[PDB]
Short mmCIF file of C-alpha atoms and ligand atoms in Angstrom, two decimals:
data_model
loop_
_atom_site.label_atom_id
_atom_site.label_comp_id
_atom_site.label_asym_id
_atom_site.label_seq_id
_atom_site.Cartn_x
_atom_site.Cartn_y
_atom_site.Cartn_z
CA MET A 2 -2.60 -9.57 -3.82
CA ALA A 3 -0.78 -11.75 -1.28
CA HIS A 4 -1.04 -11.16 2.46
CA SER A 5 1.74 -9.62 4.57
CA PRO A 6 3.76 -12.20 6.51
CA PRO A 7 1.84 -13.05 9.73
CA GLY A 8 2.34 -10.34 12.38
CA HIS A 9 3.77 -7.85 9.77
CA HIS A 10 2.30 -4.95 7.70
CA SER A 11 4.90 -4.85 4.94
CA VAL A 12 8.08 -6.40 3.61
CA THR A 13 11.47 -4.68 3.36
CA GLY A 14 13.80 -5.93 0.66
CA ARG A 15 17.26 -5.20 2.02
CA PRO A 16 19.98 -5.23 -0.63
CA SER A 17 22.58 -8.04 0.20
CA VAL A 18 24.99 -7.89 -2.85
CA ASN A 19 24.97 -4.43 -4.45
CA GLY A 20 26.47 -2.22 -1.80
CA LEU A 21 25.08 0.97 -3.37
CA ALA A 22 21.38 -0.09 -3.66
CA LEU A 23 18.81 1.32 -1.28
CA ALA A 24 15.90 -0.66 0.12
CA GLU A 25 12.66 -1.58 -1.64
CA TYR A 26 9.40 -2.12 0.15
CA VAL A 27 6.13 -4.00 -0.46
CA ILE A 28 2.70 -3.38 1.00
CA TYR A 29 -0.28 -5.65 0.55
CA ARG A 30 -3.09 -3.14 1.19
CA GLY A 31 -3.60 -0.17 -1.18
CA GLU A 32 -4.74 1.94 1.77
CA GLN A 33 -1.19 1.90 3.15
CA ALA A 34 0.10 4.41 0.56
CA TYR A 35 -0.97 7.86 -0.54
CA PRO A 36 0.37 9.33 -3.83
CA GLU A 37 1.47 12.73 -2.50
CA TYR A 38 3.53 14.11 -5.34
CA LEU A 39 3.34 13.61 -9.09
CA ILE A 40 6.73 14.34 -10.62
CA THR A 41 7.07 14.94 -14.37
CA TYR A 42 10.60 14.60 -15.73
CA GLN A 43 13.02 13.47 -18.36
CA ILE A 44 16.07 11.37 -17.90
CA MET A 45 19.18 13.29 -19.03
CA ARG A 46 21.80 11.91 -21.42
CA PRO A 47 25.18 11.80 -19.64
CA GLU A 48 27.72 14.37 -20.97
CA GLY B 30 -12.15 14.09 -6.41
CA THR B 31 -8.46 14.55 -7.30
CA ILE B 32 -6.93 17.93 -7.93
CA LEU B 33 -3.29 18.58 -8.89
CA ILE B 34 -1.58 21.68 -7.54
CA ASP B 35 1.59 22.83 -9.27
CA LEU B 36 4.46 23.64 -7.01
CA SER B 37 6.66 26.56 -7.85
CA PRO B 38 10.34 25.73 -8.31
CA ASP B 39 10.90 28.50 -5.72
CA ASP B 40 8.86 26.59 -3.12
CA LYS B 41 10.97 24.80 -0.50
CA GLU B 42 8.60 21.82 -0.93
CA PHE B 43 9.42 21.59 -4.67
CA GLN B 44 13.10 21.83 -3.82
CA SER B 45 13.11 19.11 -1.13
CA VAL B 46 11.14 16.69 -3.42
CA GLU B 47 13.52 17.43 -6.31
CA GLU B 48 16.52 16.83 -4.07
CA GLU B 49 15.15 13.36 -3.03
CA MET B 50 14.53 12.51 -6.69
CA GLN B 51 18.03 13.55 -7.85
CA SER B 52 20.07 12.34 -4.90
CA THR B 53 18.67 8.79 -4.99
CA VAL B 54 19.71 8.02 -8.57
CA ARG B 55 22.09 5.06 -8.80
CA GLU B 56 23.59 2.82 -11.46
CA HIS B 57 21.61 -0.36 -12.14
CA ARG B 58 22.89 -3.86 -12.76
CA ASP B 59 21.15 -3.96 -16.14
CA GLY B 60 23.45 -1.24 -17.51
CA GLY B 61 20.33 0.90 -18.15
CA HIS B 62 18.30 -1.69 -20.06
CA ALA B 63 15.02 -1.14 -18.20
CA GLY B 64 15.16 2.49 -17.25
CA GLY B 65 17.72 4.12 -19.52
CA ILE B 66 21.24 5.48 -19.18
CA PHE B 67 21.37 8.60 -16.99
CA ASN B 68 22.88 10.10 -13.84
CA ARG B 69 20.24 12.75 -13.25
CA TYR B 70 16.89 14.07 -14.34
CA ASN B 71 15.43 17.21 -15.84
CA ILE B 72 12.52 17.90 -13.51
CA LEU B 73 9.73 19.54 -15.53
CA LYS B 74 6.94 19.73 -12.97
CA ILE B 75 6.09 18.70 -9.40
CA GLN B 76 2.42 18.60 -8.43
CA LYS B 77 0.78 17.95 -5.09
CA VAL B 78 -1.96 15.34 -5.33
CA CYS B 79 -4.99 16.40 -3.29
CA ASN B 80 -7.89 14.01 -2.74
CA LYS B 81 -9.67 14.16 0.57
CA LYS B 82 -11.38 10.77 0.32
CA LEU B 83 -8.11 8.99 -0.62
CA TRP B 84 -6.24 10.87 2.16
CA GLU B 85 -8.82 9.79 4.74
CA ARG B 86 -8.61 6.19 3.53
CA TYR B 87 -4.84 6.43 4.04
CA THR B 88 -4.98 8.03 7.54
CA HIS B 89 -7.64 5.55 8.68
CA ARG B 90 -5.39 2.60 7.80
CA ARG B 91 -2.35 4.42 9.25
CA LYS B 92 -4.03 4.64 12.66
CA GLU B 93 -4.95 0.94 12.54
CA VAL B 94 -1.34 0.01 11.80
CA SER B 95 -0.02 2.48 14.36
CA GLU B 96 -2.28 1.03 17.08
CA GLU B 97 -1.01 -2.49 16.24
CA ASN B 98 2.65 -1.34 16.49
CA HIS B 99 3.10 0.65 19.70
CA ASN B 100 1.80 3.87 18.15
CA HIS B 101 4.35 3.78 15.32
CA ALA B 102 3.12 3.86 11.73
CA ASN B 103 6.71 3.62 10.44
CA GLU B 104 5.83 6.06 7.70
CA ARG B 105 8.24 6.63 4.83
CA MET B 106 8.34 8.78 1.66
CA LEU B 107 9.08 6.42 -1.24
CA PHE B 108 9.02 6.39 -5.05
CA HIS B 109 6.60 4.50 -7.19
CA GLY B 110 6.84 4.08 -10.98
CA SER B 111 3.94 2.60 -12.90
CA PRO B 112 2.09 2.69 -16.21
CA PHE B 113 -1.04 3.19 -14.08
CA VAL B 114 -0.02 6.50 -12.47
CA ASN B 115 -3.16 8.23 -13.83
CA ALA B 116 -5.48 5.60 -12.30
CA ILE B 117 -3.53 5.73 -9.02
CA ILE B 118 -3.84 9.46 -8.51
CA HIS B 119 -7.60 9.39 -9.23
CA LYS B 120 -8.74 6.17 -7.53
CA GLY B 121 -5.87 5.32 -5.13
CA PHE B 122 -3.65 2.28 -4.94
CA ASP B 123 -5.40 -1.13 -5.10
CA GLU B 124 -4.75 -4.76 -6.24
CA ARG B 125 -4.65 -3.72 -9.95
CA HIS B 126 -1.40 -1.85 -9.19
CA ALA B 127 0.34 -4.89 -7.61
CA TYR B 128 3.42 -6.49 -9.08
CA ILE B 129 2.10 -10.05 -9.22
CA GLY B 130 5.53 -11.49 -10.01
CA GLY B 131 7.64 -9.38 -7.66
CA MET B 132 10.45 -10.95 -5.56
CA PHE B 133 8.46 -10.55 -2.35
CA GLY B 134 5.08 -11.67 -3.62
CA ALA B 135 2.11 -9.97 -5.17
CA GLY B 136 2.02 -6.58 -3.53
CA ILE B 137 2.56 -2.93 -4.32
CA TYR B 138 6.26 -2.10 -4.57
CA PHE B 139 8.04 1.14 -3.62
CA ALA B 140 11.71 2.18 -3.79
CA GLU B 141 14.11 4.48 -1.95
CA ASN B 142 16.05 4.88 -5.21
CA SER B 143 14.09 7.01 -7.64
CA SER B 144 16.04 5.35 -10.48
CA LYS B 145 14.66 1.96 -9.37
CA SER B 146 11.05 3.22 -9.70
CA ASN B 147 12.07 4.78 -13.06
CA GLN B 148 12.59 1.24 -14.38
CA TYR B 149 8.84 0.59 -14.03
CA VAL B 150 7.39 3.78 -15.59
CA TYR B 151 6.89 2.03 -18.97
CA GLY B 152 6.11 -1.36 -17.41
CA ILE B 153 7.94 -4.31 -15.91
CA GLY B 154 11.54 -4.24 -17.11
CA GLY B 155 10.74 -0.96 -18.85
CA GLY B 156 8.25 -2.76 -21.15
CA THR B 157 8.83 -1.57 -24.71
CA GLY B 158 9.93 1.92 -23.63
CA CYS B 159 8.20 5.17 -24.40
CA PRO B 160 4.92 5.05 -26.43
CA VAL B 161 6.28 7.41 -29.13
CA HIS B 162 9.81 6.06 -29.87
CA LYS B 163 9.73 2.57 -28.20
CA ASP B 164 12.92 3.56 -26.44
CA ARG B 165 13.47 2.57 -22.75
CA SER B 166 16.26 5.19 -22.69
CA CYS B 167 14.22 7.95 -24.38
CA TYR B 168 15.59 11.38 -23.48
CA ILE B 169 12.73 13.25 -25.17
CA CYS B 170 9.52 11.81 -23.81
CA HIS B 171 8.08 13.04 -20.51
CA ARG B 172 7.98 10.48 -17.71
CA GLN B 173 6.06 10.53 -14.47
CA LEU B 174 6.80 9.08 -11.01
CA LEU B 175 4.93 9.23 -7.72
CA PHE B 176 6.58 10.21 -4.46
CA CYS B 177 4.34 8.55 -1.94
CA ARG B 178 3.59 8.48 1.75
CA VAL B 179 3.77 4.84 2.77
CA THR B 180 2.89 3.16 6.07
CA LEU B 181 5.21 0.20 6.69
CA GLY B 182 4.26 -0.63 10.26
CA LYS B 183 6.08 -3.76 11.39
CA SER B 184 8.09 -4.68 8.35
CA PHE B 185 9.39 -8.17 7.55
CA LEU B 186 13.11 -7.93 6.71
CA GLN B 187 14.16 -9.96 3.69
CA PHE B 188 17.88 -9.99 2.95
CA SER B 189 18.24 -10.46 -0.82
CA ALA B 190 20.51 -10.08 -3.84
N1 LIG C 201 4.31 -4.56 -12.34
C1 LIG C 201 4.43 -3.34 -11.81
C2 LIG C 201 3.42 -2.41 -11.99
C3 LIG C 201 3.54 -1.15 -11.44
C4 LIG C 201 4.68 -0.84 -10.70
C5 LIG C 201 5.72 -1.75 -10.54
C6 LIG C 201 6.81 -1.38 -9.73
N2 LIG C 201 7.68 -2.27 -9.24
C7 LIG C 201 8.68 -1.89 -8.41
C8 LIG C 201 9.56 -2.85 -7.93
C9 LIG C 201 10.59 -2.48 -7.07
C10 LIG C 201 10.74 -1.15 -6.67
C11 LIG C 201 9.84 -0.19 -7.15
C12 LIG C 201 8.82 -0.57 -8.00
C13 LIG C 201 7.93 0.37 -8.51
O1 LIG C 201 8.02 1.56 -8.25
N3 LIG C 201 6.93 -0.05 -9.37
C14 LIG C 201 5.58 -3.03 -11.07
ZN1 LIG C 202 10.23 8.79 -26.56
#
């Protein structure tokens, strides 16, 4: 893995084109996330 | 060390996790190529992931970050889709779960939009889709996502298309 930018613990990818997109985030240390919930699902075919 | 506890659909915790999953679906610029064509999900199960050693590893790092950032971990609940979900829940996140070619460098990626993480369940760009039908828009096969507690600390803001 890469390192975080100096003086930072993560990167935030802010959407700058698609007005409806939410943010995406990157961490560089596995210890900075805990997998709290496992969600099992299907995608649903639109009516 | 990992145990999975089923949440009841009657549990407020099930309901708040389902609501975050459903309400953060959006349309994608690929027209559904990677993740499939859908506006909502059929939630089949929500399980709490309990592993004391992995939790302690997380809270240890969280305190380090917090102490480096005026006592602010900047903790978020974010989605993660991956073919390695079974390894993650048993051994934790590590460098094997990084997206080497991601837009912001080789790190572990999370999304606010559940439908963004859904694009990665079967691999980068949806890979070849589900194991059974090779369909990235399979409506039959069961998919799994993680809803994760993530420490951002001081986050570097990248404006990007
Ligand atoms: N290569 C790879 C392996 C496992 C997960 C992912 C992944 N990438 C993302 C990129 C942006 C937003 C979310 C994700 C994600 O949930 N997984 C990417
Ligand atoms: Zn399938």
